[PDB]
Amino acid sequence: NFVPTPSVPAPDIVRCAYMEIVVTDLAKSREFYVDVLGLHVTEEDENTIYLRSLEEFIHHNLVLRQGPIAAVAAFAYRVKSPAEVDAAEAYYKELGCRTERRKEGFTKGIGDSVRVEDPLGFPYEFFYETEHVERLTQRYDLYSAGELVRLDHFNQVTPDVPRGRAYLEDLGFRVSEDIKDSDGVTYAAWMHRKQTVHDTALTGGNGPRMHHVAFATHEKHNIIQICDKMGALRISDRIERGPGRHGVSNAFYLYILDPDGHRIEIYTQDYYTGDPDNPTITWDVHDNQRRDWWGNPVVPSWYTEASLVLDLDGNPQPVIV
State the residues that interact with Mn ion by CB under 5 A: 155, 214, 265
Stretch that binds its own copies, among 53-61, 109-117, 184-192, 306-314 (CB under 8 A): 53-61
By CB atoms closer than 10 A (0-12, 13-18, 19+), residue 293 is middle
Which residue lies nearer to its own copies by CB, 42 or 158? 42
Residue ranges of the annotated binding site for Mn(2+) are 153, 212, 265
User: In angstroms, what is the minimal distance from the CB of 107 to its own copies?
Assistant: 17
Number of residues that bind its own copies (CB under 8 A): 62
Binding residue (CB under 8 A) for its own copies from 30, 60, 65, 78: 78
- Phi, psi (rounded to 5 degrees) for 203: -115, 135
User: In angstroms, what is the minimal distance from the CB of 86 to its own copies?
Assistant: 16
Which residue lies nearer to Mn ion by CB, 13 or 214? 214
Which residue lies nearer to its own copies by CB, 272 or 303? 272
Q: Which does 195 bind (CB under 5 to 8 A by kind): its own copies, Mn ion, none?
A: its own copies
Distances, alpha carbon 241 to alpha carbons 92, 215, 219, 238, in Å = 36, 15, 18, 9
Q: How far apart are CA 207 and CA 307, in angstroms?
A: 9
C-alpha R_g of the chain: 19
Q: Which does 293 bind (CB under 5 to 8 A by kind): its own copies, Mn ion, none?
A: its own copies
Handedness of CA 93, 96, 101, 105 (dihedral sign): negative
Stretch that binds its own copies, among 23-31, 101-109, 130-138, 167-175 (CB under 8 A): 130-138
Is-cis flag, bond preceding 208, omega within 30? yes
Q: State which of positions 223-252 bind its own copies (CB under 8 A).
A: 224-225, 227-234, 236-237, 239, 243, 245, 247, 250, 252
User: In angstroms, what is the minimal distance from the CB of 207 to its own copies?
Assistant: 27
Residue 289 binds to its own copies (criterion: CB under 8 A):
yes
Q: How far apart are CA 150 and CA 16, in angstroms?
A: 11
Which residue lies nearer to its own copies by CB, 28 or 132? 132
Distances, alpha carbon 41 to alpha carbons 10, 37, 49, 86, 136, in Å = 33, 12, 7, 31, 12
CA end-to-end distance (rounded Å), the chain: 17
Stretch that binds its own copies, among 119-127, 155-163, 166-174, 267-275 (CB under 8 A): 267-275
Helices (H), the chain: 26-30, 82-94, 161-170, 220-232
Residue 261 binds to its own copies (criterion: CB under 8 A):
no
Residue ranges of the annotated binding site are 153, 212, 265
Residue 166 binds to its own copies (criterion: CB under 8 A):
no
- Phi, psi (rounded to 5 degrees) for 301: -65, -25
Query: How many residues can be counted in the chain?
Result: 321
Q: Which residue in 75, 240, 258 sits closest to 158, CA to CA? A: 75
Residue 81 binds to its own copies (criterion: CB under 8 A):
yes
Please count the CA atoms within 13 angstroms of the CA of 19 that sit on its side-chain side.
28
Residue 297 binds to its own copies (criterion: CB under 8 A):
yes
Residue 34 binds to its own copies (criterion: CB under 8 A):
no
List of residues contacting its own copies (CB under 8 A)? 14-15, 55, 57-58, 78, 80-81, 128, 132, 135, 137-145, 147, 150, 194-195, 218-221, 224-225, 227-234, 236-237, 239, 243, 245, 247, 250, 252, 269, 271-272, 274-279, 289, 292-295, 297, 299
